[PDB]
Amino acid sequence: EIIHKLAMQLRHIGDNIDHRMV
Amino acid sequence: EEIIHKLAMQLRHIGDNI
Amino acid sequence: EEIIHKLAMQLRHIGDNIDHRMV
Amino acid sequence: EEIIHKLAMQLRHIGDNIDHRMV
Amino acid sequence: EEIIHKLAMQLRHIGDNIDHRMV
Amino acid sequence: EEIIHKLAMQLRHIGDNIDHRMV
Amino acid sequence: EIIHKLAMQLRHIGDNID
Amino acid sequence: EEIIHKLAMQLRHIGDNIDHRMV
Amino acid sequence: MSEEQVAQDTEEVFRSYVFYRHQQEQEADPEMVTLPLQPSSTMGQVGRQLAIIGDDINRRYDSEFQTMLQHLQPTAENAYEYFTKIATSLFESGINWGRVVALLGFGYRLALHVYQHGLTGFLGQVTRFVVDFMLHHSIARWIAQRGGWVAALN
């Protein structure tokens, strides 16, 4: 359950760094 | 003979308008 | 040269949006 | 290439103004 | 010779694809 | 016989990937 | 284009170090 | 032939460079 | 771009034009509405885009123009005599793409008038009249030089 909550939080930091980075 | 001159000069206008 | 990109940029917004619904 | 074009594109106008005095 | 070679690579390609289909 | 085969199939994968480099 | 405005400025100080 | 030749003229260039220095 | 290359391509550049121009002229003749179109050629696109750029200018002079073709009254024999004769003058002044669509428009208008006067199956000659004249009167060598018919897509 945790292992998952770790991925989706990181999706949000990734796609937020995304717009910043494109 | 004369009608012949008449078609060519029309299309010409049409052509140059195009 | 600048049309191909403007197509792939919006094409990307259609994907980005559709992605939100699928996933 | 812009000096070349506008020079040519200039020459068409006098080429169709002088064409009418011709035809 | 440039044709003979183009014909031989289309044949490798169709060959390796049928290949993936057989194993 | 069953471990043997998994070594052979992995060598095929490695081999076919290196082939794609040399051709 | 960045390459030109680099030298352009470096020219400025240059002739000013003169 | 074509790789071969490019190495030769490179050698000429370095070769004529060094000449002027010793001359 | 080869000369008669542009020639062979003139086969369906025309067949396209007449197809699309009639589909809009109505806005009839089943020899053209049914005129079979090839699959997957850019030459079809050329006949459609020129079909719809000249259409408006090809919408005023249709009254005055075909009134002449009656007083001329061309048959199935002098048709090529008449065609070449008018088209030799249409270019005797000066060449350009506007007039290249004017020849095809005469090709659309001669086709239309022969059906409407009892001449049937002659669209298969008003095509050939259009392809031979151009390869034998320096027009196909005018088109091949600028990239061809695809160059007209501008």
Added chain:
Amino acid sequence: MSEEQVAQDTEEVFRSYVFYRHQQEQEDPEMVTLPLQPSSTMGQVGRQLAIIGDDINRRYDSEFQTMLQHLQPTAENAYEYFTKIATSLFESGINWGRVVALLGFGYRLALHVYQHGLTGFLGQVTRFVVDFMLHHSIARWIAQRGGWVAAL
């Protein structure tokens, strides 16, 4: 599930896509009569993915048709243009959304050329789609998720 597997299943995924997307458009002859594979799970893939973008593809229409007309895709540059647009779509990233936005580019260019006199080219669009996806890692993406059947 192999890349080859996804490549083949892609043929029906597209021809199976266009069909239901055109039908849902009306509520092209070559798109109404578009033959569909009997009993394939892929046949359904091409209509689930057609119904999901019904919102996002509803708005972006008048967008795309003006940009296509100025690009003027003929039978020659058709693949050139397809590979070059679609490459630029996936450089930034990949995701299922941009997978679906790529098939929409296959329905929109299929439909553009037919309207511009390219009768019977939908058979080359399908291959532009499948040949762009096998030579540019997009097929390898999908099979890694299970194949198109994962999209559902």
Added chain:
Amino acid sequence: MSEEQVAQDTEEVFRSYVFYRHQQEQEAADPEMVTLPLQPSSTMGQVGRQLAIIGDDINRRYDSEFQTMLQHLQPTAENAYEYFTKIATSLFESGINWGRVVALLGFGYRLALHVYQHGLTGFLGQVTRFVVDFMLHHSIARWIAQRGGWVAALN
């Protein structure tokens, strides 16, 4: 299984592939292939029917460039073996698999068909001989042999 057993056996797996792939294509002509006789009760016509089956999707696609390339080649009666040999050695220059052996059979088919269509009639026994002669001299018949023969292709 010996080399010449596989080489002898390639007469009927090729002749059979041809009849069956044509019968394939023509339900979706080369009457030399429709009226092709098929040897009674041999597993090699079994093998030819399976190989013709397997090879359609991949083929059904690349039927345009092949047509146009074979046209600018203009093979004749005199140069067709040389071209067959030159193309066939470049195909296995990089490697040998079973799909490339079926791919080889298909270009014997594509070739026998193009030259007929272009006026080379009754040429099917020579194309068959190119196929049988290339395999034996360029080691294709030996690769097939050290795996059971052509019948092994039925998996």
Added chain:
Amino acid sequence: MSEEQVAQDTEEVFRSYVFYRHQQEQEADPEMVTLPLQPSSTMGQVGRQLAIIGDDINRRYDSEFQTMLQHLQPTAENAYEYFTKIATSLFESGINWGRVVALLGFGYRLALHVYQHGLTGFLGQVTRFVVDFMLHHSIARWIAQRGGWVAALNL
């Protein structure tokens, strides 16, 4: 009428055009007043004519044209290139009699701007750029199909 008989009358047509129109304009260029013409030159009327009928049009665009080519500042080296290059784009859109005359006017515009700029004697080369561009772009064929330069006396 061979498109080559058009090729040599043009060496006489251009020179005439430059000269007869030089004098009307003076109302300079040594090389254009030195400029001699063969006698009983029927093509000299042509260059006299073509300079006339197009004068009141050519007395309008003389403003913006003296500043355009100077930014080009042709040389002895890039003068032919700029010639053929400017002239290819004047007929990519359409031929007619004015565009061919409007072509010669610019050689004069070039052969004179070049003299005021210090390129003495370049009057011979400007005549070739005309002939040479005209033969090698199907402009001389257009003239021999219609008859030749004599038929330009019907304007």
Added chain:
Amino acid sequence: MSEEQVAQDTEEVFRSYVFYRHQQEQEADPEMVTLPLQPSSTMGQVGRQLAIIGDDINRRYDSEFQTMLQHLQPTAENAYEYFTKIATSLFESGINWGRVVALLGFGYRLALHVYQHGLTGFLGQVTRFVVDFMLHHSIARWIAQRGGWVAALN
């Protein structure tokens, strides 16, 4: 650009990622301060650029992140399992570069959190779980299509 070179370069990008991000988050981990960086590498400036971009998109989730990594309580036995179990769900929705910086960023947040519970000298294995997850899960193949890690300087 071979995928093999991206993965060998990932050594430098991560090491420098940890060192250059730690240098900002410290204004501690002894292994990450004293962290050495090879000289005259582009993966050294690349490490620098990825650690400076989403600073706030990283300083925005410290509570949520350092809370879940503590109930999970990673050890030196299950570390890699968790690393790959988590990292699979990350790019399963899709690939972009922000998620590639998000992969690294978690390692810095793993290797450090882990460090704070007593697991000394563990920074060279977190460097390893990053390198041996990308090459084996197409993350080093995606980067190879674009040029490498240096292209990330745009």
Added chain:
Amino acid sequence: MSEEQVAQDTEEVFRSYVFYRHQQEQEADPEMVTLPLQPSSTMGQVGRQLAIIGDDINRRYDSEFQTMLQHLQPTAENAYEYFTKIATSLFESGINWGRVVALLGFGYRLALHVYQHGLTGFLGQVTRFVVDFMLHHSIARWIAQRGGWVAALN
């Protein structure tokens, strides 16, 4: 070029591949660091180049292999049987130059396995497995038909 020539040339192609691939892997087994090389043969150029193209693929498929060999437990007596049986099914479906390099990698992976597990001084046995398997199972013949091992430097 003979197949027997390719077979005797295979001793130095293999010996060198081991030397140079071990040498990058280190950036252990001393029988491969001390491995003698023949002076001025282009078969040492072959084994240096082939050691290097297996750079991406071979790094990935690493612990995957050692865990499978650990289950094999090849000894001095069943290793040639085991070498043969794996290698025989690698080429059952086909041959290409890349599979030839994967057969030198498995000779390297198995030469190293047994050293690390206590079979010292066996490097020269793994070399004959490679030479002998290649000469009885048509691999040398295949290579000789392409100009020899030297054709691989493309």
Added chain:
Amino acid sequence: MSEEQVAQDTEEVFRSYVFYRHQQEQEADPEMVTLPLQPSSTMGQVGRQLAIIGDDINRRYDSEFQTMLQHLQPTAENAYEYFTKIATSLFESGINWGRVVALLGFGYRLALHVYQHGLTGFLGQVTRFVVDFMLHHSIARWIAQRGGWVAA
């Protein structure tokens, strides 16, 4: 005075420039303060008087310049392409003694922007850029026509 001797002398002309100019801007880069300096050579004084006769006009244009190198963002691989290409145009207008101290001044900053961007151990290559560009583009020679760097 050979150009080559001018080129070999430039090595410590730059080090001393880079060493001494950094000591100015300071009152960081531990590659330029540690920067060992050769003993009892005029070239240590040559580079010393040119790093000081330039701190008026340079110390001002710093922000203008470094903002461009963060837009240019040079790497360990394109550094030579750039440095050559900037300094090349710098000198296609002409050559004076201000512009040679102006050149060495860009080596000071280029070797400093990449240090401040994470490119360690490159200060030894920035001297080479100077030493190579000058001989290969006729600047070691022009300096030699006066007497060397010593005239400065």
Added chain:
Amino acid sequence: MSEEQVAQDTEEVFRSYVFYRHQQEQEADPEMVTLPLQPSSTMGQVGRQLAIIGDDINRRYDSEFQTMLQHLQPTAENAYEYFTKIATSLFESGINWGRVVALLGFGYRLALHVYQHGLTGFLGQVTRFVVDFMLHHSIARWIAQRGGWVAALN
């Protein structure tokens, strides 16, 4: 001074050019660090000066040569053929002392390149190509007509 005197004198000019040029550069190929040098020969002073009087020019184009030599893929078998073809094209337009120094350095660059690519103990073969080329292509006679290699120390 005979051309055969220059021909036998050339082995020591080349061997010594390699040693001293490898030495400045290194400030690697241990066949060149441990390269023996004849005592009290003036020819060891000729290779020392020829090696220094190309230093800067030579490092300048170092990268172009390496990458051009890799596509050549010289072997033990084709290195002479390749050495001769490059070297006959170098002097086809002209002979001067610098070009003679450039034929030494290309003997040095081909010698090092094959070593780095795995052809060991080949230094002596490269010295023979240098010497046998020069004798058989009039480069030795050129030099003998000027006092020998010793004339170069100016």
Added chain:
Amino acid sequence: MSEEQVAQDTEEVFRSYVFYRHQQEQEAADPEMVTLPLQPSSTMGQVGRQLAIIGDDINRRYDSEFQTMLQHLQPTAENAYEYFTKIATSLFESGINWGRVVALLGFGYRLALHVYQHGLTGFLGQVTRFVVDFMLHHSIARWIAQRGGWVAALN
């Protein structure tokens, strides 16, 4: 390539040209041309197959006045060679051409068909000999053998 070798080749080039042109003309009758038998596996049938198709587009602009000129000729079994010979020597009197060799075979076809419709049955074999015997005796076969033979035409 021997010019006497180009003579037997012409028997199968003409008979192939006949069959295939007739065939493609129909599909856009002389049943001696529908039932025309063709050598199996001869390159010369590929020649006659290609020579029929290149002329097709032009050979539909002139099908008319040819028809009406051969009517006032009124060829017979007796005068047809003579008229054939005299039409064919006048065709190559001003020059020889690959196209005039295809226009020679075409008049063989068009005269072979005129006589048939006009009641001369069983005459194709005499026409083929007019073509074969004219070409030999009037240096047309030597020209082609110099070019490489009829197969040179598949280019």
